Design a binder for this molecule. Structure first.
Ligand code: BES
Ligand code: 5H1
Ligand code: YB
Ligand code: YB
Ligand code: YB
Ligand code: ZN
Length: 607
């Protein structure tokens, strides 16, 4: 049972297909049209069904050419309102019918951000983008909003003719709109069954550039050249991912670089991965995000978590594959460096929540919990740590990668639970069941806090980061003179970031130390978003008033939640910037992404 959904479950009925015909109205900030759901009964004598909705206006529901009765239940907070539909004729098991729902979204749809022209790069045209994961698809259209159900889809999207629509699907042509010659209709087809959280739409002044045999990059004109360079490794990553996972079944792998308010680093929308423009470091150093979203084309989009309680299945396996891709590209020592880094991030998350908090469990219970509030590095890094620990237990990376590929083949096009995964693990490693029985399954899967065992990590690339961080932490005033730009000589951007992560873990440092760090390393000059983020956090937590405007600027000029939330939170905790932090939020709130606005508000204890 999916406790995040109010819809009929898959054991009652199953959506097979969605045909979406809609029009994007920028003047009203609404999407209007029809969602035609092909639904298969899973029960004898089925006379009604229930769908998820959130802030949707329902005009009518049509079956067999006639309007039918429906009722909207009372709103249940972030879950929205259940929509019960009375079928005109009782259905037998496996019978399929088509239900056409006429609907309109609210301008406040939590799935959508509507951008004015001034919020874009080009400054002439408006822009719209969606983000459905986890449970926001219901805020665009009525559906069984649960990843336990998979469906194909086709869509026709009417937009002002100067603009371009793209979706998580294969592009299927464009025409003038016969009802309004100021508009164009873009058509789309997704022929691989997907969970509805993978439905995506963007509308804006988009151009494209080819960067590989199956990849275009899309953005506004002013970002195209930079993005084409930044993500030039994409095809080589796809080839490695195919070796690890089996065939790529989705046809195209395009990339869309969003405006700065995109709340995530990446989102694995099928055929069209969405990325933050904060990846545009100029040197490809943040390309692990591409490798990660590529990997979801197997772990997530083919084998899918059955409910959000089992989210770690999606993210843990994907981080595991991500790090393997990067390991092939740049070496096994680099894979170990990033694995160790991720353990550090797990340390941070556990410290933040508290070692007994329910959100530090690998498998969670999301009953009455908004997924956006529970979201953290835990499913990512506790999940990766489990897989990395099992890798080392069961005989190494090539043995465990054999399992991963067999796992993907086994559960392709299905939605599964932790027990399904574990059962298959035991089946596959039939001859190592005694080794498997040494794992403390109850602790790993269901207990809060750090995992019961830390895996073994090569320290080669990490040693210099730790060494330099320790020099700074143990330095006294009379030691500050010895630090010099040459300290950074042999460190990669990845190592500089890790040096800062190590140091941030022991923050605050004395203000004089941080002032010296800027004097000799000039971190204010670095544009790499990950580095700048940790440096600004270090400054604010160490009470450097000079860093206040810098932190405010970064918190607001982009909206990746990873950066925006902790920067606002740090700014709120520093007495000198507290009032500015709350004021800046209040002034920006209306033009923020709805999810980001909500979470920053909660973080700051405002509204
Ligand atoms: C390299 C990755 C760790 C990057 C990470 N992105 C992801 O994990 C994406 O695949 C996730 N699909 C992001 C997500 C998770 C849950 C709800 C909405 C969106 C991110 O930070 O955005
Ligand atoms: O967005 C999500 C989805 C599933 C989850 N499980 C735990 C946190 C979480 C967040
Ligand atoms: Yb076609
Ligand atoms: Yb001294
Ligand atoms: Yb208030
Ligand atoms: Zn992911």
């Amino acid at each position: 049972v999916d406790t995040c959904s109010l819809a009929s479950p898959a054991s009652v009925c199953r959506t097979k297909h969605l045909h979406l015909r809609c029009s994007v109205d920028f003047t009203r900030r609404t999407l209007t049209g029809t969602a035609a759901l092909t639904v298969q009964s899973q029960e004898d004598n089925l006379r009604s069904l229930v769908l998820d909705t959130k802030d949707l206006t329902i005009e009518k529901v049509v079956i067999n050419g006639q309007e039918v009765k429906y009722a909207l239940g009372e709103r249940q907070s972030y879950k929205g309102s259940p929509m019960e539909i009375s079928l005109p004729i009782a259905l037998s098991k496996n019978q399929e019918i088509v239900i056409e729902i006429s609907f309109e979204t609210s301008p406040k749809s939590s799935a959508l951000q509507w951008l004015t022209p001034e919020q874009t790069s080009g400054k002439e045209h408006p822009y719209l983008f969606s983000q459905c994961q986890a449970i926001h698809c219901r805020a665009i259209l009525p559906c069984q909003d649960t990843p336990s159900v998979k469906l194909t889809y086709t869509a026709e999207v009417s937009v002002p003719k100067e603009l371009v629509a793209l979706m998580s699907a294969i592009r299927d042509g464009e025409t003038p709109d016969p009802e309004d010659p100021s508009r164009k209709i873009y058509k789309f087809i997704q022929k691989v069954p997907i969970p509805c959280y993978l439905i995506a739409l963007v509308v804006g002044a988009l151009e494209s550039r080819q960067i590989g045999p199956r990849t275009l990059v899309w953005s506004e004109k002013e970002q195209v050249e930079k993005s084409a360079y930044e993500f030039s490794e994409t095809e080589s990553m796809l080839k490695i991912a195919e070796d690890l996972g089996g065939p790529y079944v989705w046809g195209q792998y395009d990339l869309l670089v969003l405006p700065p308010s995109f709340p995530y680093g990446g989102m694995e929308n099928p055929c069209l991965t969405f990325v933050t423009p904060t990846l545009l470091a100029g040197d490809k150093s943040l390309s692990n995000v591409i490798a990660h979203e590529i990997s979801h084309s197997w772990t997530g989009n083919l084998v899918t978590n059955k409910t959000w309680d089992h989210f770690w299945l999606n993210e843990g396996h994907t981080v595991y594959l991500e790090r393997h891709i990067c390991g092939r590209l740049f070496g096994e020592k680099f894979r170990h460096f990033n694995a160790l880094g991720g353990w550090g991030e797990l340390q941070n998350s556990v410290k933040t929540f508290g070692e007994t908090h329910p959100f530090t469990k690998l498998v969670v219970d999301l009953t009455d919990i908004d997924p956006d509030v529970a979201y953290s590095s835990v499913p990512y890094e506790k999940g990766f740590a489990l897989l990395f620990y099992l890798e080392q237990l069961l005989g190494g990376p090539e043995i465990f990668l054999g399992f991963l590929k067999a796992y993907v083949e086994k559960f392709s096009y299905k939605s599964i639970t932790t027990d399904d995964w574990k059962d298959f693990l035991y089946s596959y490693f039939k001859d190592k069941v005694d080794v498997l029985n040494q794992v403390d399954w109850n602790a790993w899967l269901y207990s809060p806090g750090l995992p019961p065992i830390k895996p073994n990590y090569d320290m080669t690339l990490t040693n210099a980061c730790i060494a330099l961080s320790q020099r700074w932490i143990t330095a006294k005033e009379d030691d500050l003179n010895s630090f010099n730009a040459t300290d950074l000589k042999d460190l990669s951007s990845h190592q500089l970031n890790e040096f800062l992560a190590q140091t941030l873990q022991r923050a605050p440092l004395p203000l004089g130390h941080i002032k010296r760090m800027q004097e000799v390393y000039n971190f204010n000059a670095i544009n790499n978003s990950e580095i700048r983020f940790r440096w600004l956090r270090l400054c604010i937590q160490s009470k450097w008033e000079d860093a206040i405007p810098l932190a405010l600027k970064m918190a607001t000029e982009q909206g990746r939640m990873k950066f925006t939330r902790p920067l606002f939170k740090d700014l709120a905790a520093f007495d000198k910037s507290h009032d500015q932090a709350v004021r800046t939020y209040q002034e920006h709130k209306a033009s923020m992404h709805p999810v980001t606005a909500m979470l920053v508000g909660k973080d700051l204890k405002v509204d």
